[PDB]
């Protein structure tokens, strides 16, 4: 498994793309912390699917824009599994505000949770001399600049910091990039987006940091 021996924290992991990431990570050998803000029952369903595979997972409640709750979420990984290898800042990436026509003041409120989670994980990445950060956003001083800042400051601890921009309509789920696909009935399953998170979360990307992958089906090519 690409993630054998690794511990991953996925914020907003109970549904949708977050749930697909947790399942894909467990499939690749990870121990998984399923963070949720509200839907405990959905996060427990992910934990149950992962345990049925023969892997390990725990759910944790936290709104990670609140600093103590970001720390709690990171600490749950260390307390249950001893370390935190991968942090996936998924929570909030495809909120309705993230999909509508307008924008630079919407991306700076969604930037506080990723900032606090990285800040809390950094202590452990430094002790481990290893870490993986994946930020998540949706297509349109913000998330990309923060991705590269962390990449530069944590490189010497063997931490990579990358970002995935989601730009397709997933089946679990008014900007023209999504109107086009809805009228054309072209949907992606969340499971089809998870491999990019496995890539940026395992040693396939050891030498790839500060970079963006746009999961948008080529839409920007028009």
Resolution of the experimentally solved model in angstroms = 1.8
Q: Convert the chain into a string of H (helix), E (strand) and C (coil).
A: CCCCCCEEEECCCCCHHHHHHHHHHHHCCCEEEEEECCCHHHHHHHHHHHHHCCCCEEEEECCCCCHHHHHHHHHHHHHHHCCCCEEEECCCCCCHHHHCCCCHHHHCCCCHHHHHHHHHHHHHHHHHCCEEEEEEEECCCCHHHHHHHHHHHHHHHCEEEEEEEECCCECCCCCHHHHHHHHCCCCECHHHCHHHHHHHHCHHHCCCCCCEEEECCCHHHC
Nearest to 87, CA basis, from 56, 54, 124 = 124
Cα distance between residue 147 and residue 150, in whole Å: 6
Tokens linked to 219: 């839409």
- Tokens standing for 25? 């990570």
Q: Is the dihedral of CA 176, 199, 201, 80 positive or negative?
A: positive
The C-alpha atoms of residue 25 and residue 29 are separated, in whole angstroms, by 7
């Amino acid at each position: 498994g690409k993630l054998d021996g690794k511990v991953a924290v996925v914020t907003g992991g109970g549904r949708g793309v977050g749930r697909a990431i947790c399942v894909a990570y467990a499939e690749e050998g990870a121990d998984v912390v399923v963070n949720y803000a509200g839907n405990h029952a959905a996060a427990n369903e992910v934990v149950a699917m992962i345990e049925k595979m023969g892997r390990r997972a725990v759910a944790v409640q936290g709104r990670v824009e609140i600093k103590a709750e970001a720390e709690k979420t990171i600490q749950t990984a260390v307390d249950n599994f001893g370390r935190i290898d991968v942090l996936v800042n998924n929570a909030g990436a495809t909120k309705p505000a993230m999909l509508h026509k307008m924008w630079d003041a919407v991306v700076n409120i969604h930037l506080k949770g990723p900032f606090l989670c990285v800040q809390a994980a950094a202590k452990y990445f430094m002790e481990q001399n290893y870490g993986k950060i994946i930020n998540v956003t949706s297509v349109a001083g913000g998330i990309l600049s923060f991705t590269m800042s962390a990449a530069r400051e944590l490189a010497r601890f063997n931490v990579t910091s990358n970002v995935i921009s989601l730009g397709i309509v997933t089946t679990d789920m008014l900007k023209e990039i999504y109107m086009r696909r809805i009228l054309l009935n072209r949907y992606a399953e969340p499971s089809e987006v998870a491999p990019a998170f496995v890539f940026f979360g395992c040693d396939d990307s050891k030498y790839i940091t500060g970079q963006l992958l746009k999961v948008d089906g080529g839409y920007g090519l028009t």
